Ligand binder design. Structure first.
Ligand SMILES: CCCCCCCCCCCCC(=O)SCCNC(=O)CCNC(=O)[C@H](O)C(C)(C)COP(=O)(O)OP(=O)(O)OC[C@H]1O[C@@H](n2cnc3c(N)ncnc32)[C@H](O)[C@@H]1OP(=O)(O)O
Lengths: 382, 383
């Protein structure tokens, strides 16, 4: 028995740790707790990176008491993976379960109707995985079909939507719980004079989890209503991008590579993704649609906006999420989805997509891989 | 959105294994020599009986004695060696994977440009970009191939990649899914210790290998496509009272795994209820009237399941043969079993790809304790 019509997002939930990192105070915090305050010139460059990041605040699970309890974590490169794993194999499923619960609350259906669980995280790795623990913490059926996807990266938010679409539409009644979660205790480390690449990540990455319920044939009879339709999906590797975005599980924890070319590579290639995605729909004005864009960095948004001459209203939700949360990897793009529909409602727009009918969702991550989802809005009943 | 009509079918199967071979009869001595542990005479005899009862004749292993020479940290029990293992496996895991995909693509006989999705699972490593990215580049797939990277599933992953491919191939007309599993046990090789019988078991049963399948719906005989097994339904479940019995952990010392002795009994004591749920809609109750494609996680698992259900000697022939010639290769093993089942059936002139039976069941078992189940239907072999 296959489902009729397209899969849609029926609910969204998000969660963040309680502890907060004010970006104005982070240079002082970072260089103090890492006992690197003598690197004045480096701290000066780090301060400019933080000030230019357009991040006002992040939530982070790792706090100063964790650092005093294990000073090894504040060093630059030091065998710490066990200590990080010990924390994250617990916290990642926990924070993920927090976001799942809020999404199920909105959804308003028995957890026994959840037939599938998709879980993605780049912050940890274990067997059984975070899908198992999150399922147990939620009290889901022991026969929930799980799709565990460790170490995707920041494109992963588009991935779980792609996976959920085919599952929901091919299985009548299937209701897919897809959650992303990342905790940057996996890659926190101290500064080195030879790494501005490190400092960039230390300034932009924050903690969070985002969960959605995906399903076809929404049942208004019992309180289900979709927010966004998932119309088509794609995934591609950008040319001349090899090595530009990388992340590795090592004895020192998560070690990442981040090339300065990434913003230009995305901007110079993204229009082909739009043509490839919207030519069948007959759309060519990239301002006549709504955008749900992963804010991988201020620069990425700025350059895409520049190359395509996008009105400033398109990345408003991306920038607001980046300001209040930083880059949370795979979850970030679903935070933006949620903000888009909450702002549309609060501003009296006619649809959940800022008043537009058609939209596009993008994730960017290692590859350099681009995840794309053409999405359709729903009218807002007033 | 144009969806496919009819069920998704395995259209091709290819496998690969490292070249260096470990003979089980010599492995107790070889293992305790290279690990500088010949003074553990009572633990070695203990280890010799585990290997004697394992019903494993040989295994394929990428890690050789020269590797242990270059890095002696790999032969100690619990030394920080992850970086050295990863340096090897981020390269070798996709490579061996590509070798198996290449054979599957060969049998399939269709252009690589027709591959629309690539599924890759492996428990031996993790990286970003992952083995899926590199396996696709090694193969020459389209940069727009849709990848599904599933790191650290474990021994049930062979059923998972089938369950994932089923929904993709059926919801997308023309979709051709390349699913591959691959594991290399340099991720978990380590020296012995009198306080870890689980390790000894793992060092005796785990071997290297990769296996890849081409999965699609609406097979096109005009272009040379021939189905092998139809994927009918799928299930995943967590066995009750099974917490912590199968585990694997990426640590500074590499992959550390747990294996509780009760795993055979827990599987055998729960498996029939998996059969009932899977075959009651089809109207089948006799577990000897169907063929089996069973992950040979260990000789004890097959033995106990065989007893509990009174399965006849034909069911586990292919599982035990793969186990004897390759050991436990984790996620790929069950796919090695599928391949031999359809190959032996034609060599023996059986009515179908499933040993003459129409309906069958595929099982993977792993961390959870997780059981992956796939009801499968064979395709007639016409003579
Ligand atoms: C905490 C643990 C983390 C754990 C992670 C969890 C898992 C995730 C795995 C995957 C990880 C891989 C990634 O991480 S994927 C993130 C994608 N996001 C981007 O790719 C950001 C886009 N970029 C921007 O948003 C702006 O660049 C930014 C940073 C706001 C700055 O704002 P600004 O406008 O001022 O730009 P400037 O050029 O002026 O830079 C000012 C100075 O920083 C230097 N600089 C910048 N960029 C650099 C780079 N790339 N390399 C080396 N130097 C770099 C410049 O050279 C200059 O230095 P100088 O010339 O000496 O003065």
């Amino acid at each position: 028995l296959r489902a009729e019509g397209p899969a849609s997002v029926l609910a969204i939930g998000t969660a963040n740790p309680e502890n907060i990192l004010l970006q104005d105070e982070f240079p002082d915090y970072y260089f103090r707790v890492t006992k690197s305050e003598h690197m004045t010139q480096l701290k000066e460059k780090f301060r400019k990176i933080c000030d230019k990041s357009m991040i006002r605040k992040r939530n982070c699970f790792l706090n100063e008491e964790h650092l005093k309890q294990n000073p090894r974590l504040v060093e630059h490169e030091m065998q710490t993976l066990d200590a990080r794993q010990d924390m994250l194999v617990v916290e990642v499923p926990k924070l993920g379960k927090d976001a799942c619960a809020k999404a199920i609350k909105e959804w308003g259906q028995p957890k026994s109707k959840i037939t599938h669980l998709i879980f993605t995280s780049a912050s940890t790795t274990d067997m059984p995985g975070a899908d198992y623990h999150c399922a147990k913490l939620l009290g889901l059926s022991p026969s929930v079909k799980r799709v565990m996807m460790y170490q995707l990266g920041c494109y992963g938010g588009g991935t779980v939507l792609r996976i959920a679409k085919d599952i929901a539409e091919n299985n009548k009644g299937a209701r897919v719980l897809a959650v992303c979660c990342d905790i940057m205790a996996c890659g926190f480390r101290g500064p080195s004079e030879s790494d501005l690449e490190l400092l960039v990540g230390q300034a932009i990455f924050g903690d969070g989890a985002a969960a959605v319920i995906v399903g076809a044939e929404p049942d208004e009879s019992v309180g289900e209503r979709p927010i966004f339709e998932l119309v088509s999906t794609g995934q591609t590797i950008l040319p001349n991008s090899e090595g530009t975005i990388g992340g590795h599980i090592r004895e020192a924890g998560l070690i990442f590579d981040l090339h300065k070319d990434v913003p230009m590579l995305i901007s110079n290639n993204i229009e082909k993704c739009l043509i490839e995605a919207f030519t069948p729909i007959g759309i060519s004005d990239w301002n006549s649609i709504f955008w749900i864009t992963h804010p991988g960095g201020k620069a990425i948004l700025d350059k895409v906006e520049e190359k395509l001459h996008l009105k400033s209203d398109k990345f408003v939700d991306s920038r607001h999420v980046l300001s209040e949360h930083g880059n949370m990897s795979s979850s970030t793009v679903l935070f933006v989805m949620d903000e888009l529909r909450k702002r549309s409602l609060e501003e009296g727009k006619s649809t959940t997509g800022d008043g537009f009918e058609w939209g596009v969702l993008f994730g960017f991550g290692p590859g350099l891989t681009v995840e794309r989802v053409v999405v359709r809005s729903v009218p807002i009943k007033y």
